[PDB]
Amino acid sequence: MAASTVHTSFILKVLWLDQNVAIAVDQIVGKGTSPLTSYFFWPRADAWQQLKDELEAKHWIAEADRINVLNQATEVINFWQDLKNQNKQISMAEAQGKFPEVVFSGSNLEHHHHHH
């Protein structure tokens, strides 16, 4: 069969908390997306480190891809840290204006029980 090479791109998600923030990446599959990594809660846990660690463990990820999502993830973390010190009290929408490709979410439902 004449099979072509597809690029499984990766999308960054950010769960925004009151005094915390979590990050989680998905893989773009032929029929949509699939949860690649779970929400790592920064700064309580080493979010960025565990995120890249997952990407380094998943050896089917390319350098360009992992570095890209790590760059924007770093910007989200620096953005958050910037807010925590200045108490800017900005809105979720204002963060969306900064990160157009990043999917933000809220802790409305249970993410403590591992089903994602």
Side-chain angles (χ1 to χ4, degrees):
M1 303 180 183
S4 62
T5 299
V6 60
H7 178 264
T8 303
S9 299
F10 303 102
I11 307 183
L12 180 66
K13 299 191 303 300
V14 174
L15 201 173
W16 198 272
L17 296 177
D18 309 84
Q19 62 169 329
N20 301 271
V21 54
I23 55 180
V25 177
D26 307 294
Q27 59 175 91
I28 298 184
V29 192
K31 288 184 293 297
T33 59
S34 295
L36 189 66
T37 69
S38 184
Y39 285 103
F40 308 110
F41 298 87
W42 158 275
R44 306 188 309 187
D46 302 278
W48 191 79
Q49 186 62 212
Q50 295 179 149
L51 179 59
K52 72 185 303 294
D53 182 77
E54 290 291 279
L55 298 176
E56 295 171 272
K58 305 172 188 299
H59 294 92
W60 60 282
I61 283 57
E63 176 178 77
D65 292 299
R66 71 180 185 200
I67 298 300
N68 180 38
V69 299
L70 290 178
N71 296 328
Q72 63 196 215
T74 296
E75 298 192 80
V76 178
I77 299 180
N78 292 330
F79 184 78
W80 178 87
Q81 179 69 270
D82 184 82
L83 307 181
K84 178 67 73 66
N85 289 271
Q86 298 177 91
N87 296 90
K88 280 175 165 291
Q89 300 176 331
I90 57 81
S91 175
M92 173 285 193
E94 302 185 67
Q96 287 288 267
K98 210 299 183 185
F99 308 103
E101 300 177 281
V102 181
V103 182
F104 282 58
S105 64
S107 60
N108 184 212
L109 294 74
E110 269 299 299
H111 193 78
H112 306 119
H113 300 281
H114 272 82
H115 49 257
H116 277 309

